[PDB]
Design a protein around this ligand. Structure first.
Ligand SMILES: CC(C)CCC[C@@H](C)[C@H]1CC[C@H]2[C@@H]3CC=C4C[C@@H](O)CC[C@]4(C)[C@H]3CC[C@]12C
Ligand SMILES: *[C@@H]1O[C@H](CO)[C@@H](O)[C@H](O)[C@H]1NC(C)=O
Ligand SMILES: *[C@@H]1O[C@H](CO)[C@@H](O)[C@H](O)[C@H]1NC(C)=O
Ligand SMILES: *[C@@H]1O[C@H](CO)[C@@H](O)[C@H](O)[C@H]1NC(C)=O
Ligand SMILES: *[C@@H]1O[C@H](CO)[C@@H](O)[C@H](O)[C@H]1NC(C)=O
Ligand SMILES: *[C@@H]1O[C@H](CO)[C@@H](O)[C@H](O)[C@H]1NC(C)=O
Ligand SMILES: *[C@@H]1O[C@H](CO)[C@@H](O)[C@H](O)[C@H]1NC(C)=O
Lengths: 604, 588
């Protein structure tokens, strides 16, 4: 409160007062005037506080004047360049140490907290610390550190055996710019919760970085580029947190963990990898075979009467089932199966074969009905057949993937889902959908303009029609190739559809798609009405009047099918996952595929 | 191990060895030469083993000769006719009891397991018993029986009040020909887990079969064929697995149970009744109102009444969770989709009436097999409409109710007839769609040459196609496929080997017929382009060509979505009937 009284006085000086609650007096120094603490200062001070004094650098003998110090705090000191930790450590009875808002405090040297058996907690946050303090410890400390914090600093490396024998609950290294943690970074220490989150640049961890530790209850690595989690030392974690670490493709063996109860992973399939371990756990037959032999008794020795100990291959899975994982699998990211129900499997196979057969029918019957004179709309019908063929290829990819990956999907799931293959599948699907939409709109507009101007005596240029076709093709291609990048990812579904909306920009992409669907529906309705009016004005030819009738059936069926599409989208304004997303998938796989599959029987 | 080692040296005889580990000597007998009790024997038999023994009958004097026997094991007693439980009861020194592979054991008399508070296991494996032993444990017993087992046997009956207070942890009566279980079969017995699996013949489980017993933590009736389940006794039950029981469609309400922690059922609607009990719990209001008050007091001491009870029940997970193939509380799932199917069925029926009027006005006076083909296509459209209507009214009748009485609709007759109508309508429509193009092609080709298809042949082929649709529709009534596995009543199951063949053959045949029809119409249009027919036929040819092409466009996508895919039900219910009623518009 001495600092508060000084700030109320606004006098850049040191003021002290004695408190009866603790006996020792409290002194605070403040302002730019004080370059060093004045000599006429009491020595029995327990609590020493410094508000942005002009101390440029703490000398190795700076704090030695006052032996009875018990608490320290330094704040806002913009002039602090370097501090020698030894002089601070000479303070035997130092209970708490805090340093904040020092921007230029580039280094703290020496083995801190050594020879100081009374430290209770350390707070070092929002400082320009450019290297890890060399924290050592010894077993004399009667009270463990409540919290030791280095968050908000700029540390980048943790060399061999930097933090030894510290006994503490919470240790935090978040927000730092770590690039590597070397082997044996910790040693002999026990931590209740070690924090390593919000560290974008952390790529490589040494395989034995957490080896030789004396205990680690909970650990979190969220927002990290960790490639492979270390195997050793982590054999006792109660909880594991690997949130938002897309580089963590393949986890180390689930067998190694022994007592974990809660685990948050980034990809959902690791949850099933933990759950579906039912047949995997008994296969180790090594050191963890002994560990399993030991853990089974640990439960079954104490679990009217009671069941006997079932074998080490069933009770271990019974215990492992209790392990809760947050990215739980769903119908959109299923385990052991891609398509699931056998009816759907055989239906997908037959429908892929039938889509290919329909494209073949398009080719053959269009060649049969082909007129000698070049026609503008033959190319459009061919492009719609191409859209149908792409849909068939997408379903073929899904079918063959389900055929190959059956019964072992959860192991291979992440590689397929994030891999190049899923991006290709999503490209195929969305490109087919957009190509069909733009092709329907283009053929409707071309027929409308040709019919309308032909009766008046003019015509829309067929080269303009080809230009519109290539413009729509580029539209579909750019709509499909963009989600390859992070505008909207294909990795959020097991069938590679773009059910992605997290960055709000992906929401912009989906809004653009929905708006284009609405514009296509409105344009088709209006252009078809105008076509009906023009047909009322004048009649068409005969041998190609089959195509005119096909346009009329487009007038009917396109409106019939796209009318409930927007209605379902509007009724799904809540956007409930796994229900509205399924509706969107069904809409995409129905309504463009309507015309796509119709193409043979439509065009004949 | 020691007995087998001694037997390996051509041990066609009885032999004894004084093992230092057990103190008392171990004795073994082997070979058909041992047709009776041992010749001169030893009186200090500690462990007893008899393998492939030619013993004929057992009399209490057999064991009284050497009352020191502590463990017993009888194996491969091929000739063994009968044993008396009294003989083993007198041998109170016994702790182990094994009897295996007896091929013709007809009966075991007396009360086995009585008089002996030291037996720890009773392992009767494949004894072929034609009547179960009257096993009993008296009040004086104190050793926890580790396991009592009756493996593959000929136990046709359990009879009333058979078993008296057995204290075994696990009772296994599996792989049995049980035809009936009279009441009180396990009176006052205390069991931890009871397994009755793999007894197909069990069809008369009494209401008091498990009455008054001291309780079971788990009860297993896997692969039974029971017609009902008693309410009494199972109140304390902690685990009930009823996988693959096909006949238990009248399960008492989950409220009757009080301590389930895990349950298995073959029909997911039972688990939906578990979760949706929310409105059923308070409906009881009988003496079970007092029972529910008691259990609510217990639950609240353990840590509104209805919400807490339903949370507790939701904690009772069941493996057959509900699925999209049979959504609970509704067939339509959505109210907007309900009005959509209502409007499509109304459009179907109104269009059918309009088509009746149109056929009445435009019908040609002269006989025409073409008009017959059009009539049967209109009938196919009408039956699609009636299938739509019955599904819609079934949803309306069971609005919000589709967890009670759900099973009877799927299995009893409603789904059977509805699926019959649906598939018959679809197949008749497809086959008529093929026949009309076949008529067009045959008439087009032959008339130019100067011939015509036989009208009798055409009528007979139309009747044959009608019969093909009928036989395709009737088959899933049997076990070749199933209507039962969907609230929409469509034939969705594909599990059995024949089911996959049936389903894939149906779909592939439909699409192949459509492709062949398209090829035939391509031939027709090529002929028309090359040669000009008579104008009277030319107008009719053009009208029918437009009709067929428009019908193709309307029909095709429905099966595509039904295969590539709630919304599946919506599309099958909406777009296909839309084609069905839109096609006559293209007819006229
Ligand atoms: C489910 C909601 C969103 C949309 C439902 C679509 C309804 C309104 C559509 C689909 C099929 C349509 C019918 C299709 C064909 C014809 C013939 C034509 O002369 C117009 C009327 C009539 C009879 C249409 C009436 C409107 C109709 C019934
Ligand atoms: C501390 O910081 C302020 C703000 O930069 C600075 O102006 C001031 O001189 C320092 N001392 C006090 C007492 O505010
Ligand atoms: C120490 O002396 C300085 C001047 O030398 C004076 O301003 C200050 O108040 C003194 N402080 C104490 C605690 O005596
Ligand atoms: C600090 O501890 C080290 C540990 O080796 C010891 O050598 C040193 O003398 C101590 N210094 C003081 C000032 O107590
Ligand atoms: C029976 O008597 C024979 C001959 O005296 C003796 O050797 C043998 O040990 C006895 N027991 C058996 C089982 O043959
Ligand atoms: C029992 O032993 C006899 C004679 O050694 C042998 O023929 C017979 O096969 C054996 N029993 C069985 C079931 O094999
Ligand atoms: C055991 O049987 C004997 C006669 O065999 C009988 O006297 C006795 O009461 C029985 N004991 C028990 C505990 O049933």
């Amino acid at each position: 409160h001495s600092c508060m009284a000084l700030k109320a006085e606004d006098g850049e000086g040191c003021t002290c007062k004695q408190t009866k609650r603790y006996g020792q007096p409290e002194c605070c120094c403040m302002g730019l005037i004080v370059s060093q603490l004045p000599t006429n200062l009491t020595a029995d001070v327990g609590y020493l506080y410094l508000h942005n004094t002009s101390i440029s650098v703490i000398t190795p003998n700076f704090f030695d004047k006052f032996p009875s110090i018990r608490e320290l705090e330094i704040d806002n000191s913009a002039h602090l360049e370097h501090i020698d930790g030894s002089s601070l450590s000479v303070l035997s009875k130092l209970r708490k140490l805090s340093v904040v808002k020092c921007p230029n405090l580039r280094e703290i040297s020496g083995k801190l907290l050594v020879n100081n058996t009374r430290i209770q907690n350390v707070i070092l946050k929002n400082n320009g610390l450019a290297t890890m303090p060399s924290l050592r410890m010894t077993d004399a400390h009667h009270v463990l550190l409540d919290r030791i914090d280095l968050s908000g600093n700029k540390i980048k490396f943790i060399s061999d055996s930097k933090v030894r024998n510290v006994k503490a609950r919470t240790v935090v290294l978040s927000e730092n710019k770590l690039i590597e943690i070397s082997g044996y970074a910790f040693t002999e220490s026990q931590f209740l919760k070690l924090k390593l989150n919000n560290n974008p640049d952390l790529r490589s961890l040494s395989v034995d970085a957490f080896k030789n530790m004396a205990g680690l209850q909970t650990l979190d690595l969220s927002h990290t580029s960790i490639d492979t989690l270390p195997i050793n030392g982590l054999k006792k974690l109660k909880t594991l947190i690997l949130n938002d670490v897309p580089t963590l493709k393949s986890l180390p063996s689930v067998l190694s963990f022994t007592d974990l109860e809660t685990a948050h992973f980034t990809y959902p399939h690791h949850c099933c990898l933990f759950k579906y371990v039912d047949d995997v756990t008994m296969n180790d037959n090594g050191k963890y075979q002994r560990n399993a032999k030991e853990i089974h008794k640990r439960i079954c020795d104490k679990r009217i009467g009671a069941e006997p100990c079932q074998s080490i291959g069933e009770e271990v899975q019974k215990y492992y089932s209790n392990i809760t994982c947050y990215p739980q699998p769903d119908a959109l990211n299923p385990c052991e199966n891609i398509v699931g129900y056998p009816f759907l499997r055989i239906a997908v196979w037959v429908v892929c074969l039938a889509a290919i057969v329909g494209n073949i029918i398009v080719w053959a019957l269009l060649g049969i009905v082909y007129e000698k004179r070049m026609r503008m709309h033959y190319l459009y019908m061919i492009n719609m057949s191409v859209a149908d063929m792409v849909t068939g290829i997408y379903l073929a990819v899904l079918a063959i993937a389900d055929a190959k990956m059956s019964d072992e999907y959860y192991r291979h799931a992440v590689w397929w889902q994030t891999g190049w293959g899923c991006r290709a599948a999503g490209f195929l699907a969305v490109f087919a959908s957009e190509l069909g939409i733009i092709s329907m709109f283009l053929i409707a507009f071309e027929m409308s303009y040709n019919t309308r101007q032909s009766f008046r005596g003019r015509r829309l240029s067929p080269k303009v029609g080809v230009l519109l076709m290539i413009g729509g093709w580029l539209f579909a291609i750019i709509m499909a190739i963009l989600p390859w990048f992070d505008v909207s990812s294909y990795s959020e579904s097991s069938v590679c559809l773009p059910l992605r909306a997290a960055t709000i920009f992906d929401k912009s992409y989906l809004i653009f798609g929905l708006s284009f669907n609405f514009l296509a529906f409105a344009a088709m309705a209006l252009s078809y009405g105008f076509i009906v009016k023009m047909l009322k004005e004048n009649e068409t030819r005969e041998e190609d009047r089959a195509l005119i009738t096909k346009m009329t059936v487009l007038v009917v069926t396109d409106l019939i099918c796209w009318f409930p599409t927007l209605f379902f989208g509007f009724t799904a304004t809540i956007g409930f996952p796994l229900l509205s997303l399924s509706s969107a998938k069904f809409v995409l796989v129905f309504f463009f595929p309507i015309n796509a599959f119709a193409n043979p029987f439509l065009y004949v």
